[PDB]
Design a protein around this nucleic acid. Structure first.
Ligand SMILES: [Mg+2]
Ligand SMILES: [Mg+2]
Ligand SMILES: [Mg+2]
Ligand SMILES: [Mg+2]
Ligand SMILES: [Mg+2]
Ligand SMILES: [Mg+2]
Ligand SMILES: [Mg+2]
Ligand SMILES: [Mg+2]
Ligand SMILES: [Mg+2]
Ligand SMILES: [Mg+2]
Ligand SMILES: [Mg+2]
Ligand SMILES: [Mg+2]
Ligand SMILES: [Mg+2]
Ligand SMILES: [Mg+2]
Ligand SMILES: [Mg+2]
Ligand SMILES: [Mg+2]
Ligand SMILES: [Mg+2]
Ligand SMILES: [Mg+2]
Ligand SMILES: [Mg+2]
Ligand SMILES: [Mg+2]
Ligand SMILES: [Mg+2]
Ligand SMILES: [Mg+2]
Ligand SMILES: [Mg+2]
Ligand SMILES: [Mg+2]
Ligand SMILES: [Mg+2]
Ligand SMILES: [Mg+2]
Ligand SMILES: [Mg+2]
Ligand SMILES: [Mg+2]
Ligand SMILES: [Mg+2]
Ligand SMILES: [Mg+2]
Ligand SMILES: [Mg+2]
Ligand SMILES: [Mg+2]
Ligand SMILES: [Mg+2]
Ligand SMILES: [Mg+2]
Ligand SMILES: [Mg+2]
Ligand SMILES: [Mg+2]
Ligand SMILES: [Mg+2]
Ligand SMILES: [Mg+2]
Ligand SMILES: [Mg+2]
Ligand SMILES: [Mg+2]
Ligand SMILES: [Mg+2]
Ligand SMILES: [Mg+2]
Ligand SMILES: [Mg+2]
Ligand SMILES: [Mg+2]
Ligand SMILES: [Mg+2]
Ligand SMILES: [Mg+2]
Ligand SMILES: [Mg+2]
Ligand SMILES: [Mg+2]
Ligand SMILES: [Mg+2]
Ligand SMILES: [Mg+2]
Ligand SMILES: [Mg+2]
Ligand SMILES: [Mg+2]
Ligand SMILES: [Mg+2]
Ligand SMILES: [Mg+2]
Ligand SMILES: [Mg+2]
Ligand SMILES: [Mg+2]
Ligand SMILES: [Mg+2]
Ligand SMILES: [Mg+2]
Ligand SMILES: [Mg+2]
Ligand SMILES: [Mg+2]
Ligand SMILES: [Mg+2]
Ligand SMILES: [Mg+2]
Ligand SMILES: [Mg+2]
Ligand SMILES: [Mg+2]
Ligand SMILES: [Mg+2]
Ligand SMILES: [Mg+2]
Ligand SMILES: [Mg+2]
Ligand SMILES: [Mg+2]
Ligand SMILES: [Mg+2]
Ligand SMILES: [Mg+2]
Ligand SMILES: [Mg+2]
Ligand SMILES: [Mg+2]
Ligand SMILES: [Mg+2]
Ligand SMILES: [Mg+2]
Ligand SMILES: [Mg+2]
Ligand SMILES: [Mg+2]
Ligand SMILES: [Mg+2]
Ligand SMILES: [Mg+2]
Ligand SMILES: [Mg+2]
Ligand SMILES: [Mg+2]
Ligand SMILES: [Zn+2]
Lengths: 138, 151, 208, 99, 124
RNA sequence: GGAGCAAACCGGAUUAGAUACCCGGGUAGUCCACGCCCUAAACGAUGCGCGCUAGGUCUCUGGGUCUCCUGGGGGCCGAAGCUA
RNA sequence: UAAACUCCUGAACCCGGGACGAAACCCCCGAGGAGGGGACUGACGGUACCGGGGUAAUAGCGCCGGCCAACUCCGUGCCAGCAGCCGCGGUAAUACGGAGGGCGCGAGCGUUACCCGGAUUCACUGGGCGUAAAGGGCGUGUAGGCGGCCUGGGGCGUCCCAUGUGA
């Protein structure tokens, strides 16, 4: 029955990126679209769209990657250096406006569910609202 | 012709019928005191010789360090299996606060303001490798938008 | 108070020429010019590379001994700097220079810093009119560091002022050699100063 | 103002009185997780119109008896025996812990 | 553990026992000597240490080490207990203060008089 | 209930000694019925569930027009990754 | 450069002067009100402070093997002693005791006691459990905890502004 669809989703990306996949699927859901919506707004994924799987709604998340690399073991750069859920189903994390974290000194992003939508760290701060800290990315 | 300064020199040994023969090891670090820095570990049957070797290995290895008026660009948690080390940018006039090891490294990296600390293990050798692979992971604002650009 | 003990002695331990004295330190004999090695039965022996501690220590001791001031007060100011904003390192030095008995030295009224403490203490000096005898006293910007009336025609006061003719000194300072008085124009930028001490190491030491 | 609590009846076995269970939830003072505790209050009900399992509202009121400083306000819903179960089941378990 | 487990069980608070039952917080405790005798050191050493059992005012009864060279403690000398064990001697968890009460200071000592209760001499 | 085996126990040998290893003999026990005990290197020394992340090889078992595709087990080598 | 020696200043000490802290209640004009004017009262204290004269005028304590800044000589010989740990001392001790020298801090310097830190060594931030300490011998299931996709009503949590409180 799973638990947090979001957690496994971010996991799909993490698992896929480490092996350098073209893209991967994930059951369809309003919230996941929002995640990828912001995940593309700040540019971490090439994009996405509702794809089918034997009558089952999924979402193709076309991954993004860095340039090839010289030296021993030509490992491509990762566009997603790190991604991890914060407000878990076990512990609900809710933060006020003047509490929102700064992901690796601005270089990062903190997706969080606002009482007025879904916003990034800077974007939520700008609108002047707080909400459930979903996760961060950098 | 960068600046050079060793970290430590131990005296490991081997057992073998009749007696125990030794082999000294020496950790050394190199840097121009501005972005250009490299670390090297050299083993050799003698003290000054082992340093001499470390010299070549140190100048061999090297890593670009995105500075910032003397400070680093951002914090990083780097776990080298056993050991773990975290850096964090500091406002000018702070200082290089760290362990004996990561001090020399960042000092020859032209750094003058940084918050750090060692966790888990503290093996000087392992701590070294951790700091190096840490700086190697640093990313300037440019480097980020460069990879995120992909246009 | 200050260690009355041998002072041309310390010049040797630090390994740097130190003008704790006045005329003699400038002559071919700050003590170090004849014996560039540290004191002790030893000193004339091959030293060893100091620990990160020893270095951070021998650097602080330099700066403290220079102003010849109590470790307590010293540490108190270092903290005083950390209290306020701005670059802690330079600002620490800035407050050391803002010290009264110090300005009297940097204003030429005295050949030595320890001598500067003497005059100030004995009230020979004055500020805006009051005979401040506290070698402490943080001199605010824009103040008349004049000389007291009775002290104007002093033998040791003249020899100093006479030799202090012309000679540019303290960019952050002014000096009316005629009326025997000066002014604390502004807080001395780190660039304006120049001491054998690296402040960055002194901060690191008080980081412990 | 006079505090008010939504809670369910769980003991109508008294004269002109009824026991109400009220659950509150809040973040752990350290672990932040949302924990759920509760307390039982005795409410004055001179009409006795409020029977068992009735989710009702209560109000901080004049001291009626030793351990009873509240009064009923109004019903919210009748059928709620499932909740009274959770309470009664908890009780049954206590019997099977001692010696 | 899970957050829940913490919520329920919680983290066990660390608690340490005092290595020295001298008092309830007293820096020193007065006590009269009873036995006074030299005892042999432990494993790596041997040097017949000057120790002494001391029945405390606190009804207790403990052994304490006498530092420095020689002393003057007999079967009724009062004295102070400083408290500081001695790895070389078993059961001894207290030191004895020199220069206080019937505990005379060390004679002829020059360096570090404070620790051994010797008033500073006068060379002249 | 009791063939064989076998702690304890008896004897032979070995040994300085030999309550033991080896040999001869032998009891409870092992077996069944009901009842109790509830421990173990009760070991994969790896809690249960769900989702992800290259393959290669042989083996048990099931469905399909079938030099192989597909689902469930049991093994060995090994991507990335983890790891003292 | 330390002293010796030359020069200069001059704490202490002596002479004289000398408070602020006090302005009311209390007396008149008016009206015992408002508004203006008038007079007592200082324990501290002849102290603070101001001016005049004026003598070079107490330094101590910890430490110096590693951590940890600071090295050599002599006595000692697992003895005498040291110690916070690792350890030191059984003729050549920078580890004991004395000396010289040095380091640290100075009217203080050391010791003992307790507290927080280092200790991410109770770990929320921030730990673990194949062999290092650690998976229950295995199940079944009660409380509790956790829960898939879409639309809608309330708005308990959560977020936001205002306001009172937060002396
Ligand atoms: Mg699209
Ligand atoms: Mg051999
Ligand atoms: Mg690890
Ligand atoms: Mg530079
Ligand atoms: Mg260690
Ligand atoms: Mg890099
Ligand atoms: Mg870079
Ligand atoms: Mg580009
Ligand atoms: Mg001294
Ligand atoms: Mg010398
Ligand atoms: Mg500051
Ligand atoms: Mg300059
Ligand atoms: Mg009733
Ligand atoms: Mg309760
Ligand atoms: Mg009653
Ligand atoms: Mg009643
Ligand atoms: Mg009803
Ligand atoms: Mg006796
Ligand atoms: Mg005697
Ligand atoms: Mg004396
Ligand atoms: Mg029978
Ligand atoms: Mg035999
Ligand atoms: Mg026999
Ligand atoms: Mg037998
Ligand atoms: Mg048989
Ligand atoms: Mg039996
Ligand atoms: Mg059976
Ligand atoms: Mg059984
Ligand atoms: Mg097995
Ligand atoms: Mg077990
Ligand atoms: Mg379990
Ligand atoms: Mg796959
Ligand atoms: Mg295949
Ligand atoms: Mg095949
Ligand atoms: Mg299939
Ligand atoms: Mg098959
Ligand atoms: Mg299979
Ligand atoms: Mg490969
Ligand atoms: Mg590999
Ligand atoms: Mg890891
Ligand atoms: Mg390996
Ligand atoms: Mg002199
Ligand atoms: Mg003199
Ligand atoms: Mg003299
Ligand atoms: Mg008078
Ligand atoms: Mg007068
Ligand atoms: Mg007068
Ligand atoms: Mg008078
Ligand atoms: Mg008068
Ligand atoms: Mg008055
Ligand atoms: Mg009147
Ligand atoms: Mg009248
Ligand atoms: Mg009146
Ligand atoms: Mg009248
Ligand atoms: Mg009146
Ligand atoms: Mg009046
Ligand atoms: Mg008079
Ligand atoms: Mg005078
Ligand atoms: Mg004198
Ligand atoms: Mg003199
Ligand atoms: Mg040293
Ligand atoms: Mg002897
Ligand atoms: Mg100690
Ligand atoms: Mg020896
Ligand atoms: Mg010695
Ligand atoms: Mg020592
Ligand atoms: Mg502690
Ligand atoms: Mg620390
Ligand atoms: Mg803690
Ligand atoms: Mg512990
Ligand atoms: Mg098991
Ligand atoms: Mg169970
Ligand atoms: Mg349940
Ligand atoms: Mg849900
Ligand atoms: Mg709704
Ligand atoms: Mg609400
Ligand atoms: Mg609320
Ligand atoms: Mg407010
Ligand atoms: Mg207020
Ligand atoms: Mg209050
Ligand atoms: Zn000099």
């Amino acid at each position: 029955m799973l638990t947090d669809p979001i957690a496994d989703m971010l996991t799909r990306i993490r698992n896929a990126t480490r092996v350098y996949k073209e893209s991967t699927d994930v059951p369809a859901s309003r919230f996941k679209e929002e995640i990828l919506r912001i995940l593309a707004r700040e540019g971490f994924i090439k994009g996405y769209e509702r794809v089918d799987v034997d009558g089952k709604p999924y979402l193709r998340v076309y991954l993004k990657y860095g340039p090839r690399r010289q030296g021993p073991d030509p490992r491509p750069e990762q566009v997603i250096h790190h991604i991890r859920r914060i407000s878990k189903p076990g512990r609900r994390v809710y933060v006020g406006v003047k509490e929102i974290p700064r992901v690796r000194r601005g270089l990062g992003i903190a997706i969080l569910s606002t009482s007025k939508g879904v916003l990034t760290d800077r974007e939520a701060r700008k609108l002047g609202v707080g909400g459930e800290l979903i996760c961060e990315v950098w | 012709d960068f600046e050079e300064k060793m970290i430590l020199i131990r005296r490991t040994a081997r057992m073998q019928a009749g007696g125990r023969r030794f082999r000294f090891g020496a950790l050394v670090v190199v840097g121009d005191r501005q972005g250009r820095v490299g670390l090297g570990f050299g083993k050799a049957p003698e003290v000054p010789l082992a340093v001499q070797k470390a010299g070549y290995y140190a100048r061999r290895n090297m890593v670009e360090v995105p500075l910032q008026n003397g400070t680093i660009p951002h914090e990083i948690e780097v776990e080298f299996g056993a050991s773990k080390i975290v850096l964090k940018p500091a406002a000018p006039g702070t200082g290089v606060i760290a362990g004996a090891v990561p001090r020399a490294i960042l000092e020859l990296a032209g750094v003058t303001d940084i918050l750090t600390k060692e966790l888990g293990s503290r093996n000087p050798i392992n701590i070294a490798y951790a700091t190096m692979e840490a700086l190697r992971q640093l990313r300037t604002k440019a480097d980020v938008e460069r990879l995120r650009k992909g246009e | 108070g200050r260690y009355i003990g041998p002072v041309c002695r310390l010049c040797r331990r630090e390994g740097v020429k130190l003008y704790l004295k006045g005329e003699r330190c400038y002559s071919p004999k700050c003590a170090m010019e004849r014996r560039p090695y540290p004191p002790g039965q030893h000193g004339q022996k091959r030293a060893r590379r100091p620990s990160d501690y020893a270095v951070r220590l021998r650097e602080k001791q330099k700066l403290r001994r220079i102003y010849g001031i109590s470790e307590r007060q010293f540490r108190n100011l270092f903290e005083e700097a950390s209290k306020k904003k701005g670059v802690t390192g330079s600002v620490f030095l800035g407050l050391l220079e803002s010290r009264l008995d110090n300005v009297v030295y940097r204003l030429g009224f005295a050949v030595s810093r320890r001598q500067a403490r003497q005059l100030v203490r004995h009230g020979h000096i004055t500020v805006n009119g009051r005979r401040v005898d506290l070698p402490s006293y943080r001199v605010r910007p824009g103040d008349e560091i004049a000389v007291a009336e009775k002290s104007r025609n002093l033998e040791l006061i003249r020899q100093n002022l006479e030799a202090m003719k012309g000679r540019k000194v303290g960019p952050w300072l002014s000096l009316d050699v005629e009326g025997m008085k000066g002014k604390f124009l502004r807080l001395p930028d780190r660039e304006d100063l120049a001491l054998p001490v690296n402040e960055q190491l002194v901060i690191e030491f008080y980081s412990r | 103002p006079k505090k008010v609590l939504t809670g369910v009846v769980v003991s109508d076995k008294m004269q002109k009185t009824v026991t109400v269970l009220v659950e509150r939830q809040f973040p752990h003072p350290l672990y932040g997780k949302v924990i759920k505790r509760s307390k039982k209050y005795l409410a004055h009900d001179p009409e006795e119109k409020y029977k068992l399992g009735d989710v009702v509202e209560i109000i901080e009121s004049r001291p009626i008896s030793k351990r009873k400083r509240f009064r009923v306000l109004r019903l919210v819903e009748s059928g709620r025996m499932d909740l009274v179960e959770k309470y009664l089941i908890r009780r049954q378990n206590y019997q099977s812990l001692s010696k | 553990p899970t957050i829940n487990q913490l919520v329920r069980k919680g983290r066990e608070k660390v608690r340490k026992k005092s290595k020295v039952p001298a008092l309830k917080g007293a820096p020193f405790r007065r006590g009269v000597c009873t036995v006074v005798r030299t005892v042999t050191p432990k494993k790596p050493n041997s040097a017949l240490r000057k120790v002494a059992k001391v029945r405390l005012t606190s009804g207790y009864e403990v052994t304490a080490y006498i530092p420095g060279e020689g002393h003057n403690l007999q079967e009724h000398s009062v004295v102070l207990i400083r408290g500081g064990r001695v790895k070389d001697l078993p059961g001894v968890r207290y030191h004895i203060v020199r220069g206080v009460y019937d505990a005379a200071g060390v004679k002829d000592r020059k360096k570090s008089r404070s620790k051994y209760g010797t008033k500073k001499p006068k060379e002249a």
